[PDB]
Swiss-Prot record, chain A:
Parent-protein start and end of this portion: 1 to 76 of 128
Residue numbers of Phosphoserine PTMs: 65
Localization per Swiss-Prot or TrEMBL: Cytoplasm; Nucleus
Provenance organism: Homo sapiens
Domain Ubiquitin-like as annotated: residue spans: 1-76
Protein's recorded name: Ubiquitin
Cross-link Glycyl lysine isopeptide (Gly-Lys) (interchain with K-? in acceptor proteins), where in sequence: 76
Site location (Interacts with activating enzyme): 54, 72
From Swiss-Prot, chain B:
Locus of motif Ubiquitin-binding 1 (UBM1): 10-27
Subcellular location: Nucleus
Domain notes: The catalytic core consists of fingers, palm and thumb subdomains, but the fingers and thumb subdomains are much smaller than in high-fidelity polymerases; residues from five sequence motifs of the Y-family cluster around an active site cleft that can accommodate DNA and nucleotide substrates with relaxed geometric constraints, with consequently higher rates of misincorporation and low processivity. Ubiquitin-binding motif 1 and ubiquitin-binding motif 2 regulate POLI protein monoubiquitination and localization to nuclear foci after UV-induced DNA damage.
Family: Belongs to the DNA polymerase type-Y family.
Portion of the parent chain present: 491 to 526 of 717
UniProt PTM: Monoubiquitinated. Protein monoubiquitination prevents POLI binding to ubiquitin via the ubiquitin-binding motif 1 and ubiquitin-binding motif 2.
Function text: Error-prone DNA polymerase specifically involved in DNA repair. Plays an important role in translesion synthesis, where the normal high-fidelity DNA polymerases cannot proceed and DNA synthesis stalls. Favors Hoogsteen base-pairing in the active site. Inserts the correct base with high-fidelity opposite an adenosine template. Exhibits low fidelity and efficiency opposite a thymidine template, where it will preferentially insert guanosine. May play a role in hypermutation of immunoglobulin genes. Forms a Schiff base with 5'-deoxyribose phosphate at abasic sites, but may not have lyase activity.
Protein name: DNA polymerase iota
Tissue expression remark: Detected in testis, and at very low levels in spleen, lung and brain. Detected in round spermatids, but not in prophase spermatocytes.
Quaternary structure note: Interacts with POLH. Interacts with REV1. Interacts with ubiquitin.
Length: 76, 36
């Protein structure tokens, strides 16, 4: 099981998750793949932004469901 | 909106993919991104 989280630059990264690896877990899947902290990610699905108080199951996310992402630079 | 307030490395044809609560996050002005 995995998904495809496309960035603000139109490029995607394959990531393994479960219906229990909620957004705070997913932020570690994207951090592991590039080094981007949970404090600078911004994850979206079906065109809305998920929350660290939900689950991937709360938003019916499944394998290959395709997601979207944005990032920041903290300020510098 | 065109690149009228977007980052110096982004395009509306790849920023209209974001919710209205992120329209205000990229129209803010950023860096470390180049649509590539």
């Amino acid at each position: 099981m995995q998904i495809f989280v496309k960035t603000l630059t139109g490029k995607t990264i394959t990531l393994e998750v479960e219906p229990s690896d909620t957004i705070e877990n997913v932020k570690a899947k994207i951090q592991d793949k590039e080094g981007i902290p949970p404090d600078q990610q911004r994850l979206i699905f079906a065109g809305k932004q998920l929350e660290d108080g939900r689950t991937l199951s709360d938003y019916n996310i499944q394998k290959e469901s395709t997601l979207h992402l944005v990032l920041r630079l903290r300020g510098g | 909106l065109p690149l009228q307030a977007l980052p110096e490395g982004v395009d509306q044809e790849v920023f209209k993919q974001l919710p209205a609560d992120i329209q205000e996050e990229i129209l803010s002005g950023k860096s470390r991104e180049n649509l590539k």
